[PDB]
Write an enzyme that holds these catalytic residues in place. Structure first.
Site, mmCIF file in Angstrom:
data_model
loop_
_atom_site.group_PDB
_atom_site.id
_atom_site.type_symbol
_atom_site.label_atom_id
_atom_site.label_comp_id
_atom_site.label_asym_id
_atom_site.label_seq_id
_atom_site.Cartn_x
_atom_site.Cartn_y
_atom_site.Cartn_z
ATOM 1 N N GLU A 36 0.797 -1.218 0.000
ATOM 2 C CA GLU A 36 0.000 0.000 0.000
ATOM 3 C C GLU A 36 0.835 1.276 0.000
ATOM 4 O O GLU A 36 0.259 2.368 -0.056
ATOM 5 C CB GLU A 36 -0.940 0.024 1.218
ATOM 6 C CG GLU A 36 -2.022 -1.045 1.220
ATOM 7 C CD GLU A 36 -2.812 -1.070 2.524
ATOM 8 O OE1 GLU A 36 -2.280 -1.575 3.542
ATOM 9 O OE2 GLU A 36 -3.962 -0.572 2.535
ATOM 10 N N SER A 40 -6.397 -6.547 -0.252
ATOM 11 C CA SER A 40 -7.488 -6.644 0.712
ATOM 12 C C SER A 40 -7.807 -8.102 1.037
ATOM 13 O O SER A 40 -8.162 -8.421 2.174
ATOM 14 C CB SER A 40 -8.736 -5.911 0.207
ATOM 15 O OG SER A 40 -9.188 -6.435 -1.027
ATOM 16 N N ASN A 74 -5.177 -9.097 3.650
ATOM 17 C CA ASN A 74 -4.986 -8.300 4.856
ATOM 18 C C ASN A 74 -6.250 -7.714 5.475
ATOM 19 O O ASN A 74 -6.234 -7.436 6.677
ATOM 20 C CB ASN A 74 -4.013 -7.138 4.577
ATOM 21 C CG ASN A 74 -2.644 -7.616 4.122
ATOM 22 O OD1 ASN A 74 -2.275 -7.475 2.950
ATOM 23 N ND2 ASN A 74 -1.886 -8.187 5.048
ATOM 24 N N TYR A 75 -7.332 -7.515 4.716
ATOM 25 C CA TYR A 75 -8.446 -6.704 5.210
ATOM 26 C C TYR A 75 -9.819 -7.358 5.171
ATOM 27 O O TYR A 75 -10.735 -6.842 5.829
ATOM 28 C CB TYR A 75 -8.514 -5.373 4.437
ATOM 29 C CG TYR A 75 -7.307 -4.498 4.707
ATOM 30 C CD1 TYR A 75 -7.214 -3.764 5.886
ATOM 31 C CD2 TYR A 75 -6.259 -4.416 3.802
ATOM 32 C CE1 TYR A 75 -6.112 -2.970 6.155
ATOM 33 C CE2 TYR A 75 -5.148 -3.617 4.060
ATOM 34 C CZ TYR A 75 -5.081 -2.900 5.241
ATOM 35 O OH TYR A 75 -3.993 -2.109 5.519
ATOM 36 N N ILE A 76 -10.009 -8.454 4.443
ATOM 37 C CA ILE A 76 -11.311 -9.109 4.350
ATOM 38 C C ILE A 76 -11.321 -10.325 5.274
ATOM 39 O O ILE A 76 -10.534 -11.263 5.093
ATOM 40 C CB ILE A 76 -11.641 -9.507 2.904
ATOM 41 C CG1 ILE A 76 -11.820 -8.252 2.040
ATOM 42 C CG2 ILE A 76 -12.901 -10.356 2.871
ATOM 43 C CD1 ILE A 76 -11.595 -8.470 0.554
#
Lengths: 522, 521
Positions: free
Chosen positions: B276, B471, B474-476
């Site tokens: 990112e 994502s 790391n994020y979902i």
């Protein structure tokens, strides 16, 4: 690395469908079915007398695959607009044929012969030079998908699998067995022999060696899945038992009576060699002096090893006359010490059971019984009464005790039971005093915890005196019920099981328990 | 796994320090003994949360709390207890801690004791090699909380002592100081200590750092915090807006950065991960990137990778404080000036943490990505998911929606336009191979490859500008996809690479009832 050489013959593919020239009617219009359409119409008709074909989700799922076989037409036909009568009648004539006794044996003789031939061809692999049996070398034929009863894909078609879909795992220089295989790999980090994607669920399916963890976990789970499937259809299975009692074959009338004992008394067949149940009552171990036919009831009285007495009775009020008649028929002209069930073994009973629900056996039946008892017992417990991990374990074991009673796992008391109970009573009395003299908070809490375990252990020791709980916990109680019990209350269900049992039930970690948890939470 | 293992055990928590506090029960003043105060203080720390309003939370807490009053007050409800004295204590040391002159010396004790206990307990030697231990501190007693709906939320977690703890050591390894309850020599286990949680009965383990067991634990912990945020997001938003109205200018600026997390899933900007590092962040926003207009705010950011990221906020339903603080920060600056003066993750996470304990920007954005994916999938009619391939298609479309939401924009793959052509060609060729197919065996295999081709074509077009892997990794919350797999019947594991399946191994045993019930409405 798990292997350096791997040699086998691949898998056996299912035989092609044989068309029968059947037809259906759609909106009064006669349609001659093509092969694939007829194959699915036939699979639907086989289930005509089951609840599944009444389930609206089941119907629409089937129709989604069935209507696609008519590209161009019938895109919006609903289940009521189709007349399957011609296919229903074919299935009836098929059942008409199998009603002949000597016609069943000749078909089973050849299906055994074809199976024995294919097993020598496909059932064996050589790994690192050692010849091992292959567990599931047969590719299952296409058919209508069914889950545990509430699967979102129930009713969908399971499309046919071909050799081109299948990957084989083999050694680099192993001969490639005949067949148009999708690909050959050489995966030394995997002990699977073949693999392909399920054409409906997308799940990868693997062929495994016998007596490996993978096949044991899969078959173990399968038994409890079949028992869970029985929950929704126990009523229909019972009626089919009574129908076997009305049979014109004497062998089938006797086998049906044994199954009736399974349903009503959770009585084993009697021929399992395994030691944890071999000394408990069973159908083949019943003798004339163990059964007295009364007017209001049948009363059973069995004296086992160490003079443990097992007594149970079946209420004959509102029961069909066939149960009493087949008992009389088996009792007539028989003396004390004579065996009641003379043409009974597990193979005969399980064949009769399999005709009612495919895969149904005595072990599955008694699993359903034991599991339901545990569920109902736990469901009745108010959450507010489960105040600690110790109390959580206590109730789980009481439920285990209830299943032990149902499945007749009676035993002679442990040799020093009364004196062991004596010593538990003095310890709790001792522990209660040490708590009322304990002053600071660390010791008051640690002694309170030890005390709580002791009184519950005491009450447990008294109640489990005459029963072997381990037999049903290991073999007949679905571990998903206890996992759900743990989720419902919040306590650690894994402490119900020894390390050996946690290995045996490793598959429960991944398994959904929504079916049982919904019952607990209703 | 190991043949020699030596360590110093685990650091037990320090005892509670009484404060001489009191409560009123039905008008009667009660002087709290130590354990009563310790519990009442743990309750007061949650005075500003919704948990103390949950009747299940209150009753569970009272079950343990009332047991401490030697037979009295066994039927007291939470309404009949006045905690005002303990509340006031909590607030006055919250005010104390918020003062930076008190934060200067609050650090003076955080540069001494921290490293002294870590040297004592936080290192192990295994086969002569020195490894750092991850979780050597035994957590203090406190009030239990699960993900929001645990049946034991509110219950007390009793204090753990050395006598409850099992130490795993070598056969001739020296048994360290402490009254340990059990010593074992288990060579097939990489854990150093173990004990039973005194409330749930679950086994707790001490692991070495950078091991798979500690990573799984901390991975699931992040997603658990994100799921918990679903129940506090309304308060978090209201606290963000209140921060924008604050009379303190540093507070207004921190709140606006948090507001950009909520509205745009904008990262802080100081995280170093290269996945990112080139995307927009609050710390790299400059005046030239922001257009404040009458009806909207426009963002326009050109990265070091020649990627242009554009988003806008419709101001018609935003509170006036948003525009006000933006005007404040932009006034009198050159186009090249930074909008944010002193913004970093520590300032942001300090602001978020005072609203929800443990809330960070990373957790906030995990909640956003996960909610995006859940909402996309919940809107899909179950009957539209007709195959494994369509199931995967929608899963990836949801992954795309989250990638867009979190600003994971990327330069298109260097050979994108030709790849799309090759996918269009195979769609056309497979259409004819099905138009010329004879047997039903051939018609089935070709049509299955055809629908796979058209789905992959639409996907390849839609995902061109976005990095979905970021994502997904790391994020979902992977429980969302497991639940989607259970809801529809298809194989969710195929959503993940083998690496991701390893990373998310904990999801196999995890419950997904929370998400599944949302889908099942």
């Amino acid at each position: 690395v798990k292997w350096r050489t791997l040699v086998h013959n691949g898998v056996a593919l299912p035989p092609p469908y044989q068309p029968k020239g059947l037809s259906i009617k759609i909106r009064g219009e006669t349609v001659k079915l093509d092969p694939l359409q007829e194959e699915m119409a036939y699979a639907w008709a086989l289930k005509k007398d089951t609840p599944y074909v009444q389930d609206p989700v089941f119907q629409k799922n089937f129709l989604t695959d069935f209507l696609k076989t008519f590209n161009g037409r019938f895109q919006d036909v609903t289940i009521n607009e189709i007349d399957f009568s011609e296919v229903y009648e074919y299935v009836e004539r098929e059942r008409q044929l199998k009603a002949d006794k000597e016609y069943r044996k000749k078909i089973s003789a050849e299906r055994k012969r074809l199976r024995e031939e294919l097993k020598a061809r496909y059932g064996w692999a050589e790994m690192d030079g050692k010849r091992f049996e292959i567990a599931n070398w047969m590719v299952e034929p296409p058919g209508i998908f069914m889950g545990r009863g509430n699967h979102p894909l129930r009713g969908r078609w399971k499309p046919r699998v071909y050799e081109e879909d299948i990957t084989l795992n083999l050694g680099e220089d192993a001969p490639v067995p005949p067949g148009n295989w999708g690909q050959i790999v050489h995966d030394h980090d995997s002990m699977w022999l073949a693999r392909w994607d399920d054409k409906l669920t997308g799940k990868e399916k693997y062929v495994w060696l016998s007596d490996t963890a993978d096949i044991k976990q899969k078959r173990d789970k399968s038994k409890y899945d079949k028992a869970e499937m029985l929950e929704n259809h126990i009523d229909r299975v019972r009626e089919k038992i009574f129908k076997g009692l009305r049979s014109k074959e004497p062998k089938m009338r006797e086998i049906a009576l044994a199954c009736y004992l399974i349903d009503r008394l959770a009585m084993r067949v009697g021929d399992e060699k395994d030691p944890d149940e071999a000394d408990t009552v069973g159908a083949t171990t019943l003798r004339v002096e163990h059964v007295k036919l009364l007017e209001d009831r049948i009363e059973f009285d069995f004296l086992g090893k160490d003079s443990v007495r097992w007594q149970k009775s079946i209420d004959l009020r509102n029961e069909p006359p066939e149960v009493r008649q087949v008992f009389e028929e088996l009792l007539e002209g028989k003396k004390e010490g004579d065996q009641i069930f003379q043409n009974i073994n597990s193979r005969h009973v399980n064949r009769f059971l399999g005709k009612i629900v495919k895969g149904l056996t005595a072990k599955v039946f008694r699993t359903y019984i034991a599991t339901k008892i545990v569920k109902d017992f736990l469901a009745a417990i108010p959450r507010e009464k489960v105040t600690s991990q110790e109390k959580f374990i206590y109730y789980a074991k009481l439920a285990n005790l209830k299943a032990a009673e149902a499945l007749n796992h009676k035993r002679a008391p442990p040799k020093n039971w009364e004196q062991s109970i004596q010593k538990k009573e003095e310890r709790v009395k001792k522990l209660m005093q040490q708590l009322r003299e304990a002053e600071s908070e660390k010791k008051k809490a640690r002694i309170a915890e030890r005390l709580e375990k002791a009184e519950l252990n005491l009450d447990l020791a008294v109640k489990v005196r005459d029963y072997n709980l381990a037999t049903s916990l290991r073999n007949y109680i679905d571990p998903r019920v206890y996992k759900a019990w743990g989720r419902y209350t919040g306590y650690e269900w894994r402490k119900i099981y020894t390390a050996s049992l946690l290995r045996k039930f490793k598959w429960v970690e991944k398994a959904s328990v929504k079916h049982v948890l919904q019952y607990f939470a209703e």
